Symmetry: C3
Protein backbone atom coordinates (compact mmCIF):
# COMPACT_ATOMS: atom_id res chain seq x y z
CA UNK A 1 0.00 0.00 0.00
CA UNK A 2 1.08 3.60 -0.71
CA UNK A 3 1.68 5.69 2.39
CA UNK A 4 1.88 9.39 1.46
CA UNK A 5 4.42 11.48 3.39
CA UNK A 6 4.99 15.20 2.78
CA UNK A 7 7.85 17.32 4.12
CA UNK A 8 9.20 20.86 3.71
CA UNK A 9 12.83 21.44 3.00
CA UNK A 10 13.93 24.94 4.04
CA UNK A 11 17.25 26.72 3.51
CA UNK A 12 18.05 29.35 6.14
CA UNK A 13 21.59 29.91 4.82
CA UNK A 14 23.11 29.10 8.23
CA UNK A 15 24.55 25.69 7.20
CA UNK A 16 27.18 26.88 4.72
CA UNK A 17 24.89 25.51 2.00
CA UNK A 18 24.74 25.22 -0.95
CA UNK A 19 28.53 25.04 -1.11
CA UNK A 20 29.13 25.55 -4.85
CA UNK A 21 32.31 23.84 -6.13
CA UNK A 22 32.91 25.72 -9.37
CA UNK A 23 34.76 23.75 -12.04
CA UNK A 24 32.68 24.42 -15.20
CA UNK A 25 26.70 29.89 -15.35
CA UNK A 26 26.00 26.38 -14.02
CA UNK A 27 27.46 23.72 -16.32
CA UNK A 28 28.81 20.15 -16.18
CA UNK A 29 31.77 19.95 -13.81
CA UNK A 30 29.92 22.06 -11.24
CA UNK A 31 29.37 20.12 -7.99
CA UNK A 32 26.96 21.25 -5.28
CA UNK A 33 27.19 19.46 -1.89
CA UNK A 34 24.20 20.63 0.13
CA UNK A 35 22.30 20.32 3.41
CA UNK A 36 19.04 22.00 4.36
CA UNK A 37 16.54 21.90 7.22
CA UNK A 38 13.68 19.45 7.07
CA UNK A 39 10.20 19.93 8.58
CA UNK A 40 6.96 17.96 8.79
CA UNK A 41 4.33 18.50 6.06
CA UNK A 42 2.11 20.41 8.49
CA UNK A 43 5.15 22.63 9.35
CA UNK A 44 4.84 21.99 13.12
CA UNK A 45 8.08 20.13 13.80
CA UNK A 46 11.72 20.09 12.84
CA UNK A 47 12.51 16.47 11.84
CA UNK A 48 16.08 16.80 10.68
CA UNK A 49 18.04 17.78 7.59
CA UNK A 50 18.67 16.87 3.97
CA UNK A 51 22.20 15.96 3.05
CA UNK A 52 23.90 15.01 -0.19
CA UNK A 53 25.16 16.10 -3.57
CA UNK A 54 23.79 17.81 -6.70
CA UNK A 55 25.77 17.19 -9.87
CA UNK A 56 25.12 19.94 -12.42
CA UNK A 57 24.26 18.25 -15.70
CA UNK A 58 23.80 21.41 -17.78
CA UNK A 59 22.54 24.98 -17.96
CA UNK A 60 19.30 25.39 -19.89
CA UNK A 61 19.51 28.75 -21.76
CA UNK A 62 15.87 28.22 -22.82
CA UNK A 63 14.13 28.12 -19.42
CA UNK A 64 16.64 30.33 -17.53
CA UNK A 65 17.32 27.37 -15.24
CA UNK A 66 19.52 24.35 -14.66
CA UNK A 67 19.28 20.57 -14.54
CA UNK A 68 20.91 18.68 -11.64
CA UNK A 69 21.37 14.98 -10.88
CA UNK A 70 20.87 14.52 -7.15
CA UNK A 71 21.84 11.82 -4.62
CA UNK A 72 20.76 12.66 -1.07
CA UNK A 73 19.05 11.64 2.11
CA UNK A 74 16.23 13.03 4.29
CA UNK A 75 16.90 12.64 8.02
CA UNK A 76 14.09 12.33 10.56
CA UNK A 77 16.05 12.10 13.86
CA UNK A 78 15.34 8.90 15.83
CA UNK A 79 12.97 7.71 13.08
CA UNK A 80 15.73 7.07 10.53
CA UNK A 81 16.09 8.32 6.97
CA UNK A 82 15.05 8.02 3.35
CA UNK A 83 17.44 8.05 0.41
CA UNK A 84 16.81 9.21 -3.15
CA UNK A 85 18.37 9.47 -6.64
CA UNK A 86 16.99 11.54 -9.48
CA UNK A 87 16.47 14.86 -11.29
CA UNK A 88 16.40 18.29 -9.62
CA UNK A 89 15.38 20.93 -12.15
CA UNK A 90 15.24 24.58 -11.08
CA UNK A 91 12.42 25.26 -13.55
CA UNK A 92 9.84 22.48 -13.01
CA UNK A 93 8.58 19.77 -10.65
CA UNK A 94 10.25 16.38 -10.83
CA UNK A 95 9.95 12.90 -9.43
CA UNK A 96 12.98 11.18 -7.87
CA UNK A 97 13.47 7.50 -7.15
CA UNK A 98 13.34 6.31 -3.54
CA UNK A 99 16.49 4.16 -3.32
CA UNK A 100 15.94 2.90 0.27
CA UNK A 101 15.61 3.85 3.95
CA UNK A 102 16.73 3.07 7.52
CA UNK A 103 14.89 2.94 10.90
CA UNK A 104 11.10 3.06 10.41
CA UNK A 105 11.94 3.58 6.70
CA UNK A 106 13.71 0.22 6.25
CA UNK A 107 12.45 -1.39 3.02
CA UNK A 108 11.23 1.92 1.60
CA UNK A 109 10.68 2.08 -2.12
CA UNK A 110 8.67 4.13 -4.61
CA UNK A 111 8.98 7.67 -5.93
CA UNK A 112 8.93 11.20 -4.53
CA UNK A 113 7.46 14.37 -6.00
CA UNK A 114 9.66 17.42 -5.69
CA UNK A 115 7.77 20.75 -5.82
CA UNK A 116 9.40 24.14 -6.43
CA UNK A 117 8.28 27.11 -4.25
CA UNK A 118 11.16 29.52 -3.56
CA UNK A 119 14.50 29.11 -5.38
CA UNK A 120 16.47 27.56 -3.97
CA UNK A 121 14.94 28.28 -0.54
CA UNK A 122 11.73 26.25 -0.03
CA UNK A 123 10.83 22.86 -1.47
CA UNK A 124 7.82 20.65 -0.82
CA UNK A 125 8.15 16.90 -1.24
CA UNK A 126 5.52 14.20 -1.33
CA UNK A 127 6.87 10.67 -0.87
CA UNK A 128 4.66 7.89 -2.25
CA UNK A 129 6.08 5.34 0.20
CA UNK A 130 5.77 1.58 -0.16
CA UNK A 131 7.51 -1.27 1.66
CA UNK A 132 7.37 -0.04 5.26
CA UNK A 133 6.88 -2.58 8.04
CA UNK A 134 4.43 -0.29 9.88
CA UNK A 135 2.14 2.72 9.46
CA UNK A 136 3.91 6.10 9.69
CA UNK A 137 3.89 7.77 13.17
CA UNK A 138 1.13 10.31 13.63
CA UNK A 139 3.47 13.26 14.28
CA UNK A 140 4.84 12.78 10.72
CA UNK A 141 1.46 12.55 8.95
CA UNK A 142 -0.49 15.67 10.02
CA UNK A 143 -2.56 17.27 7.24
CA UNK A 144 0.07 19.03 5.13
CA UNK A 145 -0.01 22.79 4.71
CA UNK A 146 -0.77 23.27 0.98
CA UNK A 147 2.45 24.57 -0.65
CA UNK A 148 2.94 28.30 -1.38
CA UNK A 149 5.79 30.86 -1.39
CA UNK A 150 4.76 32.21 2.04
CA UNK A 151 4.17 29.08 4.19
CA UNK A 152 6.59 28.85 7.12
CA UNK A 153 7.65 26.49 9.94
CA UNK A 154 6.02 27.07 13.35
CA UNK A 155 8.04 29.39 15.67
CA UNK A 156 8.80 26.55 18.09
CA UNK A 157 10.33 24.56 15.21
CA UNK A 158 12.63 27.39 14.11
CA UNK A 159 13.57 28.05 17.75
CA UNK A 160 13.99 24.30 18.51
CA UNK A 161 11.53 24.06 21.42
CA UNK A 162 10.72 20.51 22.68
CA UNK A 163 7.17 20.98 21.29
CA UNK A 164 8.54 21.84 17.81
CA UNK A 165 11.12 19.06 17.31
CA UNK A 166 10.99 15.24 16.88
CA UNK A 167 13.00 12.94 19.18
CA UNK A 168 16.75 13.53 18.61
CA UNK A 169 16.01 15.63 15.52
CA UNK A 170 18.90 15.71 13.05
CA UNK A 171 20.81 18.98 13.31
CA UNK B 1 8.76 -11.44 -13.26
CA UNK B 2 11.89 -10.20 -15.07
CA UNK B 3 11.22 -7.69 -17.83
CA UNK B 4 14.33 -7.28 -20.01
CA UNK B 5 15.04 -3.76 -21.29
CA UNK B 6 18.03 -2.87 -23.47
CA UNK B 7 19.28 0.62 -24.33
CA UNK B 8 22.24 2.22 -26.12
CA UNK B 9 24.16 4.99 -24.49
CA UNK B 10 26.00 7.13 -27.06
CA UNK B 11 28.48 9.98 -26.55
CA UNK B 12 28.55 12.51 -29.39
CA UNK B 13 30.86 14.89 -27.49
CA UNK B 14 28.36 17.76 -27.82
CA UNK B 15 27.30 17.76 -24.13
CA UNK B 16 30.57 18.91 -22.57
CA UNK B 17 30.96 15.33 -21.33
CA UNK B 18 32.82 13.63 -19.76
CA UNK B 19 33.90 16.66 -17.76
CA UNK B 20 37.05 15.34 -16.05
CA UNK B 21 37.77 16.99 -12.67
CA UNK B 22 41.45 16.18 -12.21
CA UNK B 23 42.60 15.97 -8.60
CA UNK B 24 44.66 12.73 -8.56
CA UNK B 25 46.58 8.73 -15.34
CA UNK B 26 43.17 8.15 -13.72
CA UNK B 27 43.51 7.66 -9.96
CA UNK B 28 41.49 8.16 -6.76
CA UNK B 29 40.54 11.82 -6.35
CA UNK B 30 39.54 12.01 -10.02
CA UNK B 31 35.83 12.85 -10.42
CA UNK B 32 33.96 12.46 -13.70
CA UNK B 33 30.47 14.06 -13.90
CA UNK B 34 28.94 12.84 -17.15
CA UNK B 35 25.87 12.88 -19.39
CA UNK B 36 25.35 10.98 -22.64
CA UNK B 37 22.54 10.35 -25.12
CA UNK B 38 20.24 7.42 -24.58
CA UNK B 39 18.48 5.39 -27.30
CA UNK B 40 16.13 2.42 -27.48
CA UNK B 41 17.66 -1.09 -27.81
CA UNK B 42 16.53 -1.31 -31.43
CA UNK B 43 18.23 2.10 -32.05
CA UNK B 44 15.06 3.67 -33.54
CA UNK B 45 14.31 6.36 -30.97
CA UNK B 46 16.01 8.89 -28.76
CA UNK B 47 14.61 8.32 -25.24
CA UNK B 48 16.67 10.77 -23.24
CA UNK B 49 20.05 11.00 -21.54
CA UNK B 50 22.20 9.47 -18.84
CA UNK B 51 23.28 11.77 -16.05
CA UNK B 52 25.45 11.32 -12.98
CA UNK B 53 28.91 10.84 -11.57
CA UNK B 54 31.83 8.42 -11.97
CA UNK B 55 34.24 8.30 -9.05
CA UNK B 56 37.63 6.99 -10.15
CA UNK B 57 38.62 4.24 -7.73
CA UNK B 58 41.99 3.41 -9.28
CA UNK B 59 44.07 2.95 -12.42
CA UNK B 60 44.76 -0.67 -13.32
CA UNK B 61 48.32 -0.80 -14.79
CA UNK B 62 47.68 -4.49 -15.61
CA UNK B 63 44.71 -4.20 -18.00
CA UNK B 64 45.52 -0.70 -19.36
CA UNK B 65 42.19 0.48 -17.96
CA UNK B 66 40.45 2.02 -14.96
CA UNK B 67 37.86 1.14 -12.35
CA UNK B 68 35.06 3.63 -11.58
CA UNK B 69 32.27 3.69 -8.99
CA UNK B 70 29.18 5.10 -10.69
CA UNK B 71 25.93 6.70 -9.46
CA UNK B 72 23.65 7.79 -12.30
CA UNK B 73 20.25 7.81 -13.89
CA UNK B 74 18.80 6.85 -17.30
CA UNK B 75 16.10 9.27 -18.49
CA UNK B 76 13.29 8.18 -20.82
CA UNK B 77 11.37 11.47 -21.32
CA UNK B 78 7.71 11.26 -20.24
CA UNK B 79 8.21 7.63 -19.15
CA UNK B 80 10.39 8.50 -16.14
CA UNK B 81 13.82 7.21 -15.19
CA UNK B 82 15.89 4.40 -13.70
CA UNK B 83 18.67 4.89 -11.18
CA UNK B 84 21.75 2.75 -10.62
CA UNK B 85 24.85 2.30 -8.39
CA UNK B 86 27.80 0.08 -9.20
CA UNK B 87 31.07 -0.63 -11.02
CA UNK B 88 32.08 0.84 -14.39
CA UNK B 89 35.28 -0.80 -15.60
CA UNK B 90 36.84 0.35 -18.88
CA UNK B 91 38.22 -3.15 -19.52
CA UNK B 92 35.30 -5.57 -18.94
CA UNK B 93 31.52 -5.92 -18.68
CA UNK B 94 29.94 -5.28 -15.30
CA UNK B 95 26.62 -5.49 -13.55
CA UNK B 96 25.27 -2.50 -11.61
CA UNK B 97 22.52 -2.43 -9.00
CA UNK B 98 19.17 -0.91 -9.92
CA UNK B 99 18.53 1.41 -6.96
CA UNK B 100 15.02 2.56 -8.02
CA UNK B 101 12.93 4.37 -10.66
CA UNK B 102 10.22 6.99 -11.27
CA UNK B 103 7.22 7.18 -13.67
CA UNK B 104 6.56 3.79 -15.31
CA UNK B 105 9.75 2.68 -13.50
CA UNK B 106 8.42 3.26 -9.98
CA UNK B 107 9.30 0.23 -7.83
CA UNK B 108 12.09 -0.87 -10.16
CA UNK B 109 14.67 -3.22 -8.74
CA UNK B 110 17.18 -5.78 -10.00
CA UNK B 111 20.48 -5.52 -11.83
CA UNK B 112 21.76 -4.14 -15.14
CA UNK B 113 24.42 -5.52 -17.46
CA UNK B 114 26.80 -2.92 -18.83
CA UNK B 115 28.51 -3.92 -22.11
CA UNK B 116 31.59 -2.21 -23.56
CA UNK B 117 31.65 -1.44 -27.33
CA UNK B 118 33.54 1.79 -28.08
CA UNK B 119 35.52 3.56 -25.32
CA UNK B 120 34.09 5.62 -23.93
CA UNK B 121 31.69 6.26 -26.84
CA UNK B 122 29.09 3.45 -27.10
CA UNK B 123 27.67 1.29 -24.33
CA UNK B 124 24.92 -1.31 -24.42
CA UNK B 125 22.88 -1.98 -21.30
CA UNK B 126 20.45 -4.75 -20.50
CA UNK B 127 18.24 -4.07 -17.48
CA UNK B 128 16.78 -7.17 -15.80
CA UNK B 129 13.81 -5.22 -14.43
CA UNK B 130 11.55 -6.40 -11.63
CA UNK B 131 8.91 -4.57 -9.59
CA UNK B 132 7.12 -2.58 -12.29
CA UNK B 133 3.37 -2.05 -11.99
CA UNK B 134 2.85 -2.70 -15.72
CA UNK B 135 4.43 -4.23 -18.83
CA UNK B 136 6.96 -1.99 -20.60
CA UNK B 137 5.57 0.13 -23.52
CA UNK B 138 6.10 -1.45 -26.92
CA UNK B 139 8.21 1.42 -28.30
CA UNK B 140 10.81 0.63 -25.59
CA UNK B 141 10.94 -3.15 -26.16
CA UNK B 142 11.65 -3.61 -29.90
CA UNK B 143 14.05 -6.46 -30.71
CA UNK B 144 17.43 -5.02 -29.75
CA UNK B 145 20.13 -4.56 -32.36
CA UNK B 146 22.87 -7.03 -31.28
CA UNK B 147 25.78 -4.93 -29.94
CA UNK B 148 28.85 -4.17 -32.11
CA UNK B 149 31.33 -1.30 -32.64
CA UNK B 150 29.47 -0.13 -35.78
CA UNK B 151 25.76 -0.13 -34.78
CA UNK B 152 24.24 3.36 -34.89
CA UNK B 153 21.02 5.25 -34.00
CA UNK B 154 18.52 5.76 -36.85
CA UNK B 155 18.96 9.09 -38.73
CA UNK B 156 15.62 10.42 -37.44
CA UNK B 157 16.82 9.82 -33.86
CA UNK B 158 20.09 11.72 -34.34
CA UNK B 159 18.21 14.51 -36.13
CA UNK B 160 15.37 14.53 -33.54
CA UNK B 161 12.45 13.93 -35.92
CA UNK B 162 9.03 13.21 -34.29
CA UNK B 163 9.30 9.63 -35.64
CA UNK B 164 12.71 9.14 -33.95
CA UNK B 165 12.01 10.49 -30.44
CA UNK B 166 9.81 9.41 -27.47
CA UNK B 167 7.27 11.83 -25.93
CA UNK B 168 9.13 14.78 -24.33
CA UNK B 169 12.46 12.98 -24.74
CA UNK B 170 15.09 14.12 -22.24
CA UNK B 171 17.57 16.49 -23.88
CA UNK C 1 13.27 -13.21 5.71
CA UNK C 2 16.25 -11.29 7.15
CA UNK C 3 19.63 -12.79 6.30
CA UNK C 4 22.33 -11.24 8.52
CA UNK C 5 25.71 -10.62 6.88
CA UNK C 6 28.69 -9.08 8.68
CA UNK C 7 31.91 -7.80 7.11
CA UNK C 8 35.06 -5.94 8.19
CA UNK C 9 36.25 -2.96 6.25
CA UNK C 10 39.97 -2.34 6.78
CA UNK C 11 42.16 0.55 5.60
CA UNK C 12 45.83 -0.37 5.14
CA UNK C 13 46.69 3.00 3.55
CA UNK C 14 48.05 1.31 0.41
CA UNK C 15 45.14 2.33 -1.87
CA UNK C 16 45.72 6.09 -1.92
CA UNK C 17 42.64 6.36 0.31
CA UNK C 18 40.96 8.38 1.68
CA UNK C 19 41.82 10.91 -1.02
CA UNK C 20 40.66 14.16 0.62
CA UNK C 21 39.54 16.83 -1.89
CA UNK C 22 39.75 19.97 0.22
CA UNK C 23 37.39 22.75 -0.82
CA UNK C 24 35.86 23.87 2.53
CA UNK C 25 38.63 21.18 9.66
CA UNK C 26 36.13 19.06 7.70
CA UNK C 27 33.25 21.19 6.40
CA UNK C 28 30.72 21.27 3.54
CA UNK C 29 32.52 21.39 0.19
CA UNK C 30 34.96 18.70 1.35
CA UNK C 31 34.72 15.57 -0.84
CA UNK C 32 36.25 12.24 0.15
CA UNK C 33 36.42 9.53 -2.57
CA UNK C 34 37.49 6.34 -0.83
CA UNK C 35 38.23 2.63 -1.22
CA UNK C 36 39.14 0.15 1.50
CA UNK C 37 39.69 -3.60 1.83
CA UNK C 38 36.75 -5.81 2.66
CA UNK C 39 36.87 -9.08 4.64
CA UNK C 40 34.40 -11.71 5.81
CA UNK C 41 32.80 -11.29 9.28
CA UNK C 42 34.90 -14.14 10.66
CA UNK C 43 38.03 -12.38 9.24
CA UNK C 44 39.18 -15.48 7.31
CA UNK C 45 38.88 -14.26 3.73
CA UNK C 46 39.44 -11.20 1.59
CA UNK C 47 36.18 -10.67 -0.35
CA UNK C 48 36.94 -7.44 -2.15
CA UNK C 49 36.86 -3.70 -1.54
CA UNK C 50 34.58 -0.81 -0.71
CA UNK C 51 34.40 1.98 -3.24
CA UNK C 52 32.56 5.29 -3.36
CA UNK C 53 32.24 8.81 -2.06
CA UNK C 54 31.80 10.57 1.30
CA UNK C 55 30.35 14.07 1.12
CA UNK C 56 31.26 16.06 4.22
CA UNK C 57 28.05 17.60 5.54
CA UNK C 58 29.58 19.45 8.50
CA UNK C 59 32.11 19.47 11.33
CA UNK C 60 30.61 18.88 14.76
CA UNK C 61 32.59 21.06 17.25
CA UNK C 62 30.60 19.39 20.06
CA UNK C 63 31.63 15.73 19.60
CA UNK C 64 35.08 16.38 18.05
CA UNK C 65 33.89 14.56 14.94
CA UNK C 66 32.27 14.96 11.54
CA UNK C 67 29.10 13.98 9.70
CA UNK C 68 29.37 12.52 6.18
CA UNK C 69 26.77 11.54 3.57
CA UNK C 70 28.00 8.37 1.89
CA UNK C 71 27.23 6.60 -1.42
CA UNK C 72 29.28 3.45 -1.93
CA UNK C 73 29.45 -0.20 -2.78
CA UNK C 74 30.82 -3.36 -1.11
CA UNK C 75 32.45 -5.76 -3.59
CA UNK C 76 32.59 -9.51 -2.99
CA UNK C 77 34.51 -10.72 -6.09
CA UNK C 78 32.56 -13.26 -8.18
CA UNK C 79 29.59 -12.99 -5.79
CA UNK C 80 28.65 -9.45 -6.85
CA UNK C 81 28.12 -6.35 -4.75
CA UNK C 82 25.86 -4.40 -2.42
CA UNK C 83 25.19 -0.69 -2.67
CA UNK C 84 24.29 1.75 0.09
CA UNK C 85 23.32 5.40 0.80
CA UNK C 86 23.30 7.01 4.22
CA UNK C 87 25.07 8.65 7.17
CA UNK C 88 28.70 8.04 8.18
CA UNK C 89 29.41 9.77 11.49
CA UNK C 90 32.92 9.60 12.96
CA UNK C 91 31.51 9.74 16.50
CA UNK C 92 28.70 7.13 16.63
CA UNK C 93 27.20 4.04 14.98
CA UNK C 94 24.77 4.60 12.13
CA UNK C 95 22.44 2.69 9.88
CA UNK C 96 22.61 3.15 6.09
CA UNK C 97 20.02 2.22 3.49
CA UNK C 98 20.69 -0.76 1.23
CA UNK C 99 19.92 0.70 -2.21
CA UNK C 100 20.39 -2.55 -4.20
CA UNK C 101 22.83 -5.30 -5.25
CA UNK C 102 24.18 -7.37 -8.17
CA UNK C 103 25.14 -11.08 -8.57
CA UNK C 104 23.92 -13.13 -5.58
CA UNK C 105 22.84 -9.75 -4.13
CA UNK C 106 20.34 -8.93 -6.89
CA UNK C 107 17.11 -7.68 -5.27
CA UNK C 108 18.86 -6.77 -2.02
CA UNK C 109 17.07 -4.35 0.25
CA UNK C 110 17.03 -3.41 3.93
CA UNK C 111 19.45 -1.54 6.17
CA UNK C 112 23.04 -1.92 7.36
CA UNK C 113 24.56 -1.16 10.75
CA UNK C 114 27.89 0.62 10.61
CA UNK C 115 30.06 0.15 13.73
CA UNK C 116 33.07 2.31 14.63
CA UNK C 117 36.26 0.56 15.90
CA UNK C 118 39.42 2.38 14.77
CA UNK C 119 39.17 5.80 13.07
CA UNK C 120 39.11 5.73 10.20
CA UNK C 121 40.89 2.34 10.00
CA UNK C 122 38.51 -0.50 10.98
CA UNK C 123 34.75 -0.68 10.56
CA UNK C 124 32.35 -3.53 11.23
CA UNK C 125 29.12 -3.74 9.26
CA UNK C 126 26.07 -5.90 9.78
CA UNK C 127 23.74 -6.05 6.78
CA UNK C 128 20.13 -7.00 7.57
CA UNK C 129 19.56 -8.40 4.06
CA UNK C 130 16.17 -9.06 2.52
CA UNK C 131 15.15 -9.85 -1.07
CA UNK C 132 17.83 -12.35 -2.07
CA UNK C 133 16.89 -15.22 -4.37
CA UNK C 134 18.96 -17.71 -2.34
CA UNK C 135 20.62 -18.29 1.03
CA UNK C 136 24.05 -16.66 1.42
CA UNK C 137 27.08 -18.91 0.61
CA UNK C 138 28.62 -20.54 3.66
CA UNK C 139 32.05 -18.94 3.21
CA UNK C 140 30.37 -15.51 3.71
CA UNK C 141 28.38 -16.44 6.84
CA UNK C 142 30.93 -17.87 9.31
CA UNK C 143 30.35 -16.84 12.95
CA UNK C 144 31.57 -13.24 13.01
CA UNK C 145 34.49 -12.25 15.21
CA UNK C 146 32.92 -9.89 17.80
CA UNK C 147 34.16 -6.36 16.98
CA UNK C 148 37.07 -4.78 18.90
CA UNK C 149 40.01 -2.43 18.21
CA UNK C 150 42.46 -5.37 17.98
CA UNK C 151 40.69 -7.94 15.76
CA UNK C 152 42.58 -8.59 12.51
CA UNK C 153 42.24 -10.44 9.18
CA UNK C 154 43.87 -13.90 8.99
CA UNK C 155 47.48 -13.86 7.64
CA UNK C 156 46.47 -15.71 4.47
CA UNK C 157 43.89 -12.99 3.75
CA UNK C 158 46.39 -10.13 4.11
CA UNK C 159 48.92 -12.08 2.03
CA UNK C 160 46.28 -13.11 -0.57
CA UNK C 161 46.74 -16.89 -0.36
CA UNK C 162 44.14 -19.04 -2.22
CA UNK C 163 42.86 -20.21 1.20
CA UNK C 164 42.33 -16.59 2.36
CA UNK C 165 40.52 -15.10 -0.67
CA UNK C 166 37.09 -15.61 -2.34
CA UNK C 167 36.83 -16.46 -6.06
CA UNK C 168 38.14 -13.50 -8.13
CA UNK C 169 38.22 -11.29 -5.04
CA UNK C 170 37.95 -7.58 -5.85
CA UNK C 171 41.35 -5.90 -5.64
MG1 LIG D 1 16.60 0.40 -3.95
Amino acid sequence: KVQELSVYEINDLDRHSPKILKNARFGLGDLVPFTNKLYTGDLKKRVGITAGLCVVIEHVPEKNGDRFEATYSFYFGDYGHLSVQGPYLTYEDSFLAITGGAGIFEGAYGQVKLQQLVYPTKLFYTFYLKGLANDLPLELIGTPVPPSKDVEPAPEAKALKPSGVVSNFTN
